[PDB]
Amino acid sequence: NDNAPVFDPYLPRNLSVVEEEANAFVGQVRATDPDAGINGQVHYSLGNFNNLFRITSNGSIYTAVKLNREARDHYELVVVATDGAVHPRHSTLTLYIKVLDIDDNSPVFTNSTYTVVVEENLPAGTSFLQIEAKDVDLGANVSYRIRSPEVKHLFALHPFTGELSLLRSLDYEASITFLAEAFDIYGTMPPGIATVTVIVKD
Ligand SMILES: [Ca+2]
Ligand SMILES: [Ca+2]
Ligand SMILES: [Ca+2]
Ligand SMILES: [Ca+2]
């Protein structure tokens, strides 16, 4: 047993794995040990994050659990190569793991139910309520729209700001309830939904 395991010098150190997948392949390392028999046989282990990653006998690394990018997106993973000698010799490598984002969150409204009380003579053009939804995924841009067709003659919803404005003065349709949506313009998850109730003071 003249020497330790040495990792291949040009193994990638920056590895990326998609969030929300257990048993996902992260990458593969290799350490060689130019020695005869059991002094030349390399075994792999991890020095940290053992509940989150595992390594196989050929140096392939997999997630043990679903990673959540929204909770943490980076791991400095220590890989250990040990030979089979009676006095074992070890070497280590740090890998820098990046967790990649998927669209797994719909926009979430600040309120499940917005309620607003307006004066009967509120002028046409008044913006009287702002709604707001947040999307925790990476690069998301939230846009707003009114789902319910039957109020589209009464109110307009600004697609960027979420400001709700009056199109015509109020008379007899003393409340009106409808659904608003918030969606990631380039996302794939469903829209977030919230109810809006407008109450007219007589
Ligand atoms: Ca050796
Ligand atoms: Ca997630
Ligand atoms: Ca995500
Ligand atoms: Ca999203």
JSON list of C-alpha atoms and ligand atoms in Angstrom, two decimals:
[
{"chain": "A", "resi": 1, "resn": "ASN", "atom": "CA", "xyz": [0.00, 0.00, 0.00]},
{"chain": "A", "resi": 2, "resn": "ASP", "atom": "CA", "xyz": [2.36, 2.70, -1.33]},
{"chain": "A", "resi": 3, "resn": "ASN", "atom": "CA", "xyz": [-0.26, 5.33, -2.28]},
{"chain": "A", "resi": 4, "resn": "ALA", "atom": "CA", "xyz": [-3.74, 6.75, -1.67]},
{"chain": "A", "resi": 5, "resn": "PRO", "atom": "CA", "xyz": [-6.65, 7.04, -4.10]},
{"chain": "A", "resi": 6, "resn": "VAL", "atom": "CA", "xyz": [-6.29, 10.00, -6.50]},
{"chain": "A", "resi": 7, "resn": "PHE", "atom": "CA", "xyz": [-9.38, 11.50, -8.17]},
{"chain": "A", "resi": 8, "resn": "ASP", "atom": "CA", "xyz": [-9.25, 12.19, -11.94]},
{"chain": "A", "resi": 9, "resn": "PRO", "atom": "CA", "xyz": [-8.04, 15.82, -12.24]},
{"chain": "A", "resi": 10, "resn": "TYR", "atom": "CA", "xyz": [-10.64, 17.03, -14.77]},
{"chain": "A", "resi": 11, "resn": "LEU", "atom": "CA", "xyz": [-13.82, 15.68, -13.13]},
{"chain": "A", "resi": 12, "resn": "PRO", "atom": "CA", "xyz": [-16.54, 18.36, -13.16]},
{"chain": "A", "resi": 13, "resn": "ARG", "atom": "CA", "xyz": [-16.75, 20.23, -9.84]},
{"chain": "A", "resi": 14, "resn": "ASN", "atom": "CA", "xyz": [-19.93, 22.12, -10.72]},
{"chain": "A", "resi": 15, "resn": "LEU", "atom": "CA", "xyz": [-22.80, 19.65, -10.85]},
{"chain": "A", "resi": 16, "resn": "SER", "atom": "CA", "xyz": [-26.50, 20.49, -11.29]},
{"chain": "A", "resi": 17, "resn": "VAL", "atom": "CA", "xyz": [-29.56, 18.42, -10.24]},
{"chain": "A", "resi": 18, "resn": "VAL", "atom": "CA", "xyz": [-33.29, 19.17, -10.65]},
{"chain": "A", "resi": 19, "resn": "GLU", "atom": "CA", "xyz": [-35.32, 19.81, -7.50]},
{"chain": "A", "resi": 20, "resn": "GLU", "atom": "CA", "xyz": [-38.19, 17.58, -6.29]},
{"chain": "A", "resi": 21, "resn": "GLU", "atom": "CA", "xyz": [-36.76, 14.19, -7.38]},
{"chain": "A", "resi": 22, "resn": "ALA", "atom": "CA", "xyz": [-35.40, 11.50, -5.07]},
{"chain": "A", "resi": 23, "resn": "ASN", "atom": "CA", "xyz": [-33.04, 8.97, -6.71]},
{"chain": "A", "resi": 24, "resn": "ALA", "atom": "CA", "xyz": [-31.95, 11.65, -9.23]},
{"chain": "A", "resi": 25, "resn": "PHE", "atom": "CA", "xyz": [-28.49, 11.33, -10.76]},
{"chain": "A", "resi": 26, "resn": "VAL", "atom": "CA", "xyz": [-26.22, 14.22, -9.73]},
{"chain": "A", "resi": 27, "resn": "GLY", "atom": "CA", "xyz": [-22.91, 13.10, -11.28]},
{"chain": "A", "resi": 28, "resn": "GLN", "atom": "CA", "xyz": [-20.14, 10.52, -11.06]},
{"chain": "A", "resi": 29, "resn": "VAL", "atom": "CA", "xyz": [-16.61, 10.75, -9.64]},
{"chain": "A", "resi": 30, "resn": "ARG", "atom": "CA", "xyz": [-13.68, 8.35, -10.13]},
{"chain": "A", "resi": 31, "resn": "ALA", "atom": "CA", "xyz": [-10.57, 7.85, -8.04]},
{"chain": "A", "resi": 32, "resn": "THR", "atom": "CA", "xyz": [-7.88, 5.38, -9.18]},
{"chain": "A", "resi": 33, "resn": "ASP", "atom": "CA", "xyz": [-5.36, 3.62, -6.95]},
{"chain": "A", "resi": 34, "resn": "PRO", "atom": "CA", "xyz": [-2.35, 2.20, -8.85]},
{"chain": "A", "resi": 35, "resn": "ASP", "atom": "CA", "xyz": [-1.65, -0.63, -6.38]},
{"chain": "A", "resi": 36, "resn": "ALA", "atom": "CA", "xyz": [-2.14, -4.40, -6.58]},
{"chain": "A", "resi": 37, "resn": "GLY", "atom": "CA", "xyz": [-5.30, -6.18, -5.35]},
{"chain": "A", "resi": 38, "resn": "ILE", "atom": "CA", "xyz": [-7.00, -4.79, -2.21]},
{"chain": "A", "resi": 39, "resn": "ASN", "atom": "CA", "xyz": [-4.59, -1.82, -1.88]},
{"chain": "A", "resi": 40, "resn": "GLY", "atom": "CA", "xyz": [-5.83, -0.72, -5.36]},
{"chain": "A", "resi": 41, "resn": "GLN", "atom": "CA", "xyz": [-9.59, -1.11, -4.71]},
{"chain": "A", "resi": 42, "resn": "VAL", "atom": "CA", "xyz": [-11.46, 2.18, -4.14]},
{"chain": "A", "resi": 43, "resn": "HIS", "atom": "CA", "xyz": [-14.54, 2.59, -1.91]},
{"chain": "A", "resi": 44, "resn": "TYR", "atom": "CA", "xyz": [-16.66, 5.76, -1.88]},
{"chain": "A", "resi": 45, "resn": "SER", "atom": "CA", "xyz": [-18.43, 7.64, 0.89]},
{"chain": "A", "resi": 46, "resn": "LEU", "atom": "CA", "xyz": [-19.79, 11.10, 1.65]},
{"chain": "A", "resi": 47, "resn": "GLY", "atom": "CA", "xyz": [-18.36, 13.40, 4.33]},
{"chain": "A", "resi": 48, "resn": "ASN", "atom": "CA", "xyz": [-21.56, 15.45, 4.76]},
{"chain": "A", "resi": 49, "resn": "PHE", "atom": "CA", "xyz": [-25.23, 15.79, 3.73]},
{"chain": "A", "resi": 50, "resn": "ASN", "atom": "CA", "xyz": [-25.63, 12.02, 4.09]},
{"chain": "A", "resi": 51, "resn": "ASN", "atom": "CA", "xyz": [-29.40, 12.30, 4.65]},
{"chain": "A", "resi": 52, "resn": "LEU", "atom": "CA", "xyz": [-29.72, 14.19, 1.31]},
{"chain": "A", "resi": 53, "resn": "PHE", "atom": "CA", "xyz": [-27.24, 12.41, -1.00]},
{"chain": "A", "resi": 54, "resn": "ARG", "atom": "CA", "xyz": [-25.75, 8.95, -1.43]},
{"chain": "A", "resi": 55, "resn": "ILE", "atom": "CA", "xyz": [-22.85, 7.57, -3.47]},
{"chain": "A", "resi": 56, "resn": "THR", "atom": "CA", "xyz": [-22.56, 4.14, -5.15]},
{"chain": "A", "resi": 57, "resn": "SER", "atom": "CA", "xyz": [-19.63, 1.71, -5.55]},
{"chain": "A", "resi": 58, "resn": "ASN", "atom": "CA", "xyz": [-18.77, 3.23, -8.97]},
{"chain": "A", "resi": 59, "resn": "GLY", "atom": "CA", "xyz": [-18.73, 6.81, -7.59]},
{"chain": "A", "resi": 60, "resn": "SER", "atom": "CA", "xyz": [-22.18, 7.78, -8.91]},
{"chain": "A", "resi": 61, "resn": "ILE", "atom": "CA", "xyz": [-24.02, 10.28, -6.70]},
{"chain": "A", "resi": 62, "resn": "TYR", "atom": "CA", "xyz": [-27.81, 10.36, -6.32]},
{"chain": "A", "resi": 63, "resn": "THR", "atom": "CA", "xyz": [-30.26, 12.36, -4.24]},
{"chain": "A", "resi": 64, "resn": "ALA", "atom": "CA", "xyz": [-31.59, 10.33, -1.29]},
{"chain": "A", "resi": 65, "resn": "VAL", "atom": "CA", "xyz": [-34.61, 12.65, -1.02]},
{"chain": "A", "resi": 66, "resn": "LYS", "atom": "CA", "xyz": [-36.50, 15.30, -2.98]},
{"chain": "A", "resi": 67, "resn": "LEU", "atom": "CA", "xyz": [-34.47, 18.55, -2.81]},
{"chain": "A", "resi": 68, "resn": "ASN", "atom": "CA", "xyz": [-36.48, 21.77, -2.57]},
{"chain": "A", "resi": 69, "resn": "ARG", "atom": "CA", "xyz": [-34.85, 24.66, -4.42]},
{"chain": "A", "resi": 70, "resn": "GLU", "atom": "CA", "xyz": [-37.18, 27.09, -2.62]},
{"chain": "A", "resi": 71, "resn": "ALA", "atom": "CA", "xyz": [-35.61, 25.92, 0.69]},
{"chain": "A", "resi": 72, "resn": "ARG", "atom": "CA", "xyz": [-31.94, 25.58, -0.40]},
{"chain": "A", "resi": 73, "resn": "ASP", "atom": "CA", "xyz": [-30.23, 25.65, -3.81]},
{"chain": "A", "resi": 74, "resn": "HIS", "atom": "CA", "xyz": [-26.54, 24.91, -3.12]},
{"chain": "A", "resi": 75, "resn": "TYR", "atom": "CA", "xyz": [-24.53, 22.15, -1.43]},
{"chain": "A", "resi": 76, "resn": "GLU", "atom": "CA", "xyz": [-20.79, 21.87, -0.85]},
{"chain": "A", "resi": 77, "resn": "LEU", "atom": "CA", "xyz": [-20.58, 18.07, -0.93]},
{"chain": "A", "resi": 78, "resn": "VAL", "atom": "CA", "xyz": [-17.51, 16.18, 0.41]},
{"chain": "A", "resi": 79, "resn": "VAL", "atom": "CA", "xyz": [-16.70, 12.92, -1.38]},
{"chain": "A", "resi": 80, "resn": "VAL", "atom": "CA", "xyz": [-14.28, 10.48, 0.24]},
{"chain": "A", "resi": 81, "resn": "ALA", "atom": "CA", "xyz": [-12.31, 7.77, -1.61]},
{"chain": "A", "resi": 82, "resn": "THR", "atom": "CA", "xyz": [-10.80, 5.11, 0.66]},
{"chain": "A", "resi": 83, "resn": "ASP", "atom": "CA", "xyz": [-8.71, 2.09, -0.44]},
{"chain": "A", "resi": 84, "resn": "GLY", "atom": "CA", "xyz": [-9.25, -1.44, 0.93]},
{"chain": "A", "resi": 85, "resn": "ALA", "atom": "CA", "xyz": [-5.79, -1.72, 2.60]},
{"chain": "A", "resi": 86, "resn": "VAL", "atom": "CA", "xyz": [-5.40, -2.95, 6.20]},
{"chain": "A", "resi": 87, "resn": "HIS", "atom": "CA", "xyz": [-4.13, 0.54, 7.13]},
{"chain": "A", "resi": 88, "resn": "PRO", "atom": "CA", "xyz": [-6.60, 2.50, 4.94]},
{"chain": "A", "resi": 89, "resn": "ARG", "atom": "CA", "xyz": [-5.58, 5.62, 2.99]},
{"chain": "A", "resi": 90, "resn": "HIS", "atom": "CA", "xyz": [-8.22, 8.26, 2.15]},
{"chain": "A", "resi": 91, "resn": "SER", "atom": "CA", "xyz": [-8.51, 11.25, -0.17]},
{"chain": "A", "resi": 92, "resn": "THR", "atom": "CA", "xyz": [-11.30, 13.80, -0.64]},
{"chain": "A", "resi": 93, "resn": "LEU", "atom": "CA", "xyz": [-12.91, 15.99, -3.24]},
{"chain": "A", "resi": 94, "resn": "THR", "atom": "CA", "xyz": [-15.37, 18.86, -2.81]},
{"chain": "A", "resi": 95, "resn": "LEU", "atom": "CA", "xyz": [-18.22, 19.07, -5.34]},
{"chain": "A", "resi": 96, "resn": "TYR", "atom": "CA", "xyz": [-20.38, 22.19, -5.69]},
{"chain": "A", "resi": 97, "resn": "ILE", "atom": "CA", "xyz": [-23.98, 21.10, -6.24]},
{"chain": "A", "resi": 98, "resn": "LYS", "atom": "CA", "xyz": [-26.59, 23.50, -7.69]},
{"chain": "A", "resi": 99, "resn": "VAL", "atom": "CA", "xyz": [-30.29, 22.61, -7.36]},
{"chain": "A", "resi": 100, "resn": "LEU", "atom": "CA", "xyz": [-32.21, 23.53, -10.49]},
{"chain": "A", "resi": 101, "resn": "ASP", "atom": "CA", "xyz": [-35.66, 25.13, -10.41]},
{"chain": "A", "resi": 102, "resn": "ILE", "atom": "CA", "xyz": [-38.91, 23.73, -11.72]},
{"chain": "A", "resi": 103, "resn": "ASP", "atom": "CA", "xyz": [-42.28, 25.46, -11.75]},
{"chain": "A", "resi": 104, "resn": "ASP", "atom": "CA", "xyz": [-43.85, 23.67, -8.77]},
{"chain": "A", "resi": 105, "resn": "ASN", "atom": "CA", "xyz": [-45.59, 26.65, -7.13]},
{"chain": "A", "resi": 106, "resn": "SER", "atom": "CA", "xyz": [-48.65, 28.53, -8.32]},
{"chain": "A", "resi": 107, "resn": "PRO", "atom": "CA", "xyz": [-48.84, 32.22, -7.51]},
{"chain": "A", "resi": 108, "resn": "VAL", "atom": "CA", "xyz": [-50.34, 32.67, -4.01]},
{"chain": "A", "resi": 109, "resn": "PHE", "atom": "CA", "xyz": [-52.65, 35.62, -3.35]},
{"chain": "A", "resi": 110, "resn": "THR", "atom": "CA", "xyz": [-52.08, 37.72, -0.19]},
{"chain": "A", "resi": 111, "resn": "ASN", "atom": "CA", "xyz": [-55.83, 37.30, 0.55]},
{"chain": "A", "resi": 112, "resn": "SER", "atom": "CA", "xyz": [-58.01, 34.31, -0.20]},
{"chain": "A", "resi": 113, "resn": "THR", "atom": "CA", "xyz": [-60.94, 36.78, -0.13]},
{"chain": "A", "resi": 114, "resn": "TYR", "atom": "CA", "xyz": [-60.56, 40.45, -0.88]},
{"chain": "A", "resi": 115, "resn": "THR", "atom": "CA", "xyz": [-63.52, 42.49, 0.39]},
{"chain": "A", "resi": 116, "resn": "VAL", "atom": "CA", "xyz": [-63.93, 46.16, -0.37]},
{"chain": "A", "resi": 117, "resn": "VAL", "atom": "CA", "xyz": [-66.71, 48.60, 0.49]},
{"chain": "A", "resi": 118, "resn": "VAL", "atom": "CA", "xyz": [-67.30, 51.35, -2.10]},
{"chain": "A", "resi": 119, "resn": "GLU", "atom": "CA", "xyz": [-69.52, 54.42, -2.18]},
{"chain": "A", "resi": 120, "resn": "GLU", "atom": "CA", "xyz": [-72.43, 54.19, -4.63]},
{"chain": "A", "resi": 121, "resn": "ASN", "atom": "CA", "xyz": [-71.29, 57.40, -6.35]},
{"chain": "A", "resi": 122, "resn": "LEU", "atom": "CA", "xyz": [-67.64, 56.28, -6.73]},
{"chain": "A", "resi": 123, "resn": "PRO", "atom": "CA", "xyz": [-66.50, 57.85, -10.02]},
{"chain": "A", "resi": 124, "resn": "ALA", "atom": "CA", "xyz": [-65.83, 55.77, -13.11]},
{"chain": "A", "resi": 125, "resn": "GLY", "atom": "CA", "xyz": [-62.06, 55.34, -13.47]},
{"chain": "A", "resi": 126, "resn": "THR", "atom": "CA", "xyz": [-61.35, 55.06, -9.71]},
{"chain": "A", "resi": 127, "resn": "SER", "atom": "CA", "xyz": [-58.89, 52.28, -8.76]},
{"chain": "A", "resi": 128, "resn": "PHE", "atom": "CA", "xyz": [-60.29, 51.12, -5.43]},
{"chain": "A", "resi": 129, "resn": "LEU", "atom": "CA", "xyz": [-58.42, 47.91, -4.70]},
{"chain": "A", "resi": 130, "resn": "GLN", "atom": "CA", "xyz": [-55.06, 46.37, -5.46]},
{"chain": "A", "resi": 131, "resn": "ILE", "atom": "CA", "xyz": [-54.72, 42.58, -5.40]},
{"chain": "A", "resi": 132, "resn": "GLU", "atom": "CA", "xyz": [-51.35, 40.83, -5.10]},
{"chain": "A", "resi": 133, "resn": "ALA", "atom": "CA", "xyz": [-49.98, 37.32, -5.66]},
{"chain": "A", "resi": 134, "resn": "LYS", "atom": "CA", "xyz": [-46.40, 36.03, -5.22]},
{"chain": "A", "resi": 135, "resn": "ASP", "atom": "CA", "xyz": [-44.74, 33.18, -7.08]},
{"chain": "A", "resi": 136, "resn": "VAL", "atom": "CA", "xyz": [-41.82, 31.63, -5.16]},
{"chain": "A", "resi": 137, "resn": "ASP", "atom": "CA", "xyz": [-40.30, 29.95, -8.27]},
{"chain": "A", "resi": 138, "resn": "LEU", "atom": "CA", "xyz": [-37.27, 31.35, -10.06]},
{"chain": "A", "resi": 139, "resn": "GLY", "atom": "CA", "xyz": [-37.82, 34.11, -12.66]},
{"chain": "A", "resi": 140, "resn": "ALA", "atom": "CA", "xyz": [-41.60, 34.01, -12.36]},
{"chain": "A", "resi": 141, "resn": "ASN", "atom": "CA", "xyz": [-43.58, 37.06, -13.53]},
{"chain": "A", "resi": 142, "resn": "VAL", "atom": "CA", "xyz": [-47.11, 37.28, -12.19]},
{"chain": "A", "resi": 143, "resn": "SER", "atom": "CA", "xyz": [-49.89, 38.59, -14.38]},
{"chain": "A", "resi": 144, "resn": "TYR", "atom": "CA", "xyz": [-53.54, 39.20, -13.27]},
{"chain": "A", "resi": 145, "resn": "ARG", "atom": "CA", "xyz": [-56.91, 38.65, -14.94]},
{"chain": "A", "resi": 146, "resn": "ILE", "atom": "CA", "xyz": [-60.61, 38.52, -14.06]},
{"chain": "A", "resi": 147, "resn": "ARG", "atom": "CA", "xyz": [-61.98, 35.02, -14.72]},
{"chain": "A", "resi": 148, "resn": "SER", "atom": "CA", "xyz": [-65.71, 35.80, -14.32]},
{"chain": "A", "resi": 149, "resn": "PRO", "atom": "CA", "xyz": [-67.15, 37.26, -17.61]},
{"chain": "A", "resi": 150, "resn": "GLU", "atom": "CA", "xyz": [-70.25, 38.79, -15.94]},
{"chain": "A", "resi": 151, "resn": "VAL", "atom": "CA", "xyz": [-68.24, 41.62, -14.19]},
{"chain": "A", "resi": 152, "resn": "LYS", "atom": "CA", "xyz": [-66.08, 42.60, -17.20]},
{"chain": "A", "resi": 153, "resn": "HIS", "atom": "CA", "xyz": [-68.54, 45.45, -18.04]},
{"chain": "A", "resi": 154, "resn": "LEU", "atom": "CA", "xyz": [-68.12, 46.78, -14.46]},
{"chain": "A", "resi": 155, "resn": "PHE", "atom": "CA", "xyz": [-64.47, 46.41, -13.41]},
{"chain": "A", "resi": 156, "resn": "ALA", "atom": "CA", "xyz": [-61.08, 46.24, -15.11]},
{"chain": "A", "resi": 157, "resn": "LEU", "atom": "CA", "xyz": [-58.01, 44.56, -13.59]},
{"chain": "A", "resi": 158, "resn": "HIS", "atom": "CA", "xyz": [-54.59, 45.85, -14.51]},
{"chain": "A", "resi": 159, "resn": "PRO", "atom": "CA", "xyz": [-52.53, 42.84, -15.63]},
{"chain": "A", "resi": 160, "resn": "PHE", "atom": "CA", "xyz": [-49.21, 43.98, -14.05]},
{"chain": "A", "resi": 161, "resn": "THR", "atom": "CA", "xyz": [-50.21, 46.00, -10.95]},
{"chain": "A", "resi": 162, "resn": "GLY", "atom": "CA", "xyz": [-53.30, 44.09, -9.96]},
{"chain": "A", "resi": 163, "resn": "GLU", "atom": "CA", "xyz": [-55.21, 47.42, -9.51]},
{"chain": "A", "resi": 164, "resn": "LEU", "atom": "CA", "xyz": [-58.97, 47.02, -9.83]},
{"chain": "A", "resi": 165, "resn": "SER", "atom": "CA", "xyz": [-60.81, 50.01, -11.32]},
{"chain": "A", "resi": 166, "resn": "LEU", "atom": "CA", "xyz": [-64.43, 50.95, -11.97]},
{"chain": "A", "resi": 167, "resn": "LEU", "atom": "CA", "xyz": [-65.56, 51.13, -15.61]},
{"chain": "A", "resi": 168, "resn": "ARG", "atom": "CA", "xyz": [-69.00, 52.73, -15.03]},
{"chain": "A", "resi": 169, "resn": "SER", "atom": "CA", "xyz": [-70.84, 54.21, -12.04]},
{"chain": "A", "resi": 170, "resn": "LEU", "atom": "CA", "xyz": [-72.60, 51.74, -9.70]},
{"chain": "A", "resi": 171, "resn": "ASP", "atom": "CA", "xyz": [-76.43, 51.18, -9.68]},
{"chain": "A", "resi": 172, "resn": "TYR", "atom": "CA", "xyz": [-78.25, 47.74, -9.59]},
{"chain": "A", "resi": 173, "resn": "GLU", "atom": "CA", "xyz": [-76.62, 44.41, -10.62]},
{"chain": "A", "resi": 174, "resn": "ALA", "atom": "CA", "xyz": [-75.83, 45.26, -2.84]},
{"chain": "A", "resi": 175, "resn": "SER", "atom": "CA", "xyz": [-72.62, 43.28, -3.35]},
{"chain": "A", "resi": 176, "resn": "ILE", "atom": "CA", "xyz": [-70.95, 41.50, -6.27]},
{"chain": "A", "resi": 177, "resn": "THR", "atom": "CA", "xyz": [-68.54, 38.59, -5.98]},
{"chain": "A", "resi": 178, "resn": "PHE", "atom": "CA", "xyz": [-66.22, 37.21, -8.68]},
{"chain": "A", "resi": 179, "resn": "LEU", "atom": "CA", "xyz": [-62.95, 35.34, -9.21]},
{"chain": "A", "resi": 180, "resn": "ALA", "atom": "CA", "xyz": [-59.57, 36.79, -10.11]},
{"chain": "A", "resi": 181, "resn": "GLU", "atom": "CA", "xyz": [-56.54, 34.86, -11.34]},
{"chain": "A", "resi": 182, "resn": "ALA", "atom": "CA", "xyz": [-52.78, 35.25, -11.01]},
{"chain": "A", "resi": 183, "resn": "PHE", "atom": "CA", "xyz": [-50.54, 33.30, -13.39]},
{"chain": "A", "resi": 184, "resn": "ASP", "atom": "CA", "xyz": [-46.86, 32.92, -14.32]},
{"chain": "A", "resi": 185, "resn": "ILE", "atom": "CA", "xyz": [-46.77, 34.12, -17.92]},
{"chain": "A", "resi": 186, "resn": "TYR", "atom": "CA", "xyz": [-44.22, 31.42, -18.89]},
{"chain": "A", "resi": 187, "resn": "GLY", "atom": "CA", "xyz": [-45.01, 28.90, -16.11]},
{"chain": "A", "resi": 188, "resn": "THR", "atom": "CA", "xyz": [-46.92, 25.61, -16.27]},
{"chain": "A", "resi": 189, "resn": "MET", "atom": "CA", "xyz": [-48.59, 25.40, -12.83]},
{"chain": "A", "resi": 190, "resn": "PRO", "atom": "CA", "xyz": [-52.26, 26.37, -12.44]},
{"chain": "A", "resi": 191, "resn": "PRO", "atom": "CA", "xyz": [-53.15, 30.00, -11.73]},
{"chain": "A", "resi": 192, "resn": "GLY", "atom": "CA", "xyz": [-53.60, 31.18, -8.16]},
{"chain": "A", "resi": 193, "resn": "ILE", "atom": "CA", "xyz": [-57.24, 32.13, -7.50]},
{"chain": "A", "resi": 194, "resn": "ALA", "atom": "CA", "xyz": [-58.92, 34.55, -5.14]},
{"chain": "A", "resi": 195, "resn": "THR", "atom": "CA", "xyz": [-62.44, 35.83, -4.65]},
{"chain": "A", "resi": 196, "resn": "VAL", "atom": "CA", "xyz": [-63.15, 39.51, -4.72]},
{"chain": "A", "resi": 197, "resn": "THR", "atom": "CA", "xyz": [-66.28, 40.89, -3.11]},
{"chain": "A", "resi": 198, "resn": "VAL", "atom": "CA", "xyz": [-67.28, 44.51, -3.77]},
{"chain": "A", "resi": 199, "resn": "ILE", "atom": "CA", "xyz": [-69.91, 45.90, -1.39]},
{"chain": "A", "resi": 200, "resn": "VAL", "atom": "CA", "xyz": [-71.78, 49.08, -2.32]},
{"chain": "A", "resi": 201, "resn": "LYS", "atom": "CA", "xyz": [-72.75, 51.50, 0.44]},
{"chain": "A", "resi": 202, "resn": "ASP", "atom": "CA", "xyz": [-76.25, 52.91, -0.24]},
{"chain": "B", "resi": 1, "resn": "CA", "atom": "CA", "xyz": [-3.39, 2.17, -2.07]},
{"chain": "B", "resi": 2, "resn": "CA", "atom": "CA", "xyz": [-39.78, 23.29, -4.70]},
{"chain": "B", "resi": 3, "resn": "CA", "atom": "CA", "xyz": [-39.49, 25.70, -7.94]},
{"chain": "B", "resi": 4, "resn": "CA", "atom": "CA", "xyz": [-44.55, 29.17, -10.37]}
]
